[PDB]
Design a protein around this ligand. Structure first.
Ligand SMILES: OC[C@H]1O[C@@H](S[C@@H]2O[C@H](CO)[C@@H](O)[C@H](O)[C@H]2O)[C@H](O)[C@@H](n2cc([S@+](O)c3ccccc3)nn2)[C@H]1O
Ligand SMILES: [Mg+2]
Ligand SMILES: [Mg+2]
Length: 138
């Protein structure tokens, strides 16, 4: 088990056919989780499960440029369960990130930041016990 917040280095950034796997367990009274794929201070892809926005569970995705959040993309399909182990897989494709949770497709997010090979860090934070974070080429 790792300590959160955790930084996974992505040296040489990301590239199509890269598969990033995050394994953990949601804490029993969880409020939020965040993955932040970063290009310096910019957040190319923010993936933000919210467990209690208006007694609603929702996943918010966005990009932060020059410390300004852009237009949100939201997904109400919500595969995370408090207390339960999860696997997030982020597959990099030429035109978007493709996200699956527990082996089921969840969402896609088109690339707004285009220099994939400079998205050189993944920050993992929030209300989880983080077991491992790694990547490979499929
Ligand atoms: O767009 C994505 C961003 O959303 C904003 S909230 C946004 O605020 C708008 C007005 O500016 C409203 O109009 C929108 O409706 C509403 O969604 C979040 O604060 C922003 N964030 C989330 C997080 S971690 O959870 C987190 C990190 C540290 C401590 C605790 C939690 N770190 N940064 C991001 O998720
Ligand atoms: Mg496409
Ligand atoms: Mg498309």
């Amino acid at each position: 088990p790792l300590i959160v917040p955790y930084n996974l280095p992505l040296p040489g950034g990301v590239v199509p056919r890269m598969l990033i796997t995050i394994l953990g367990t949601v804490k029993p009274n969880a409020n939020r989780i965040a993955l932040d794929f970063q290009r310096g201070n910019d957040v190319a892809f923010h993936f933000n499960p919210r467990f209690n926005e208006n007694n609603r569970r929702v996943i918010v995705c966005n990009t932060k440029l020059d410390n300004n959040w852009g237009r949100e993309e939201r997904q109400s399909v919500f595969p995370f369960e408090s207390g339960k182990p999860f696997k997030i897989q982020v597959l990099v494709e030429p035109d978007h990130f493709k996200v699956a949770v527990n082996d089921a497709h969840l969402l896609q997010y088109n690339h707004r930041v285009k220099k994939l090979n400079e998205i050189s860090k993944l920050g993992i934070s929030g209300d989880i016990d983080l077991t491992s974070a790694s990547y490979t080429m499929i």
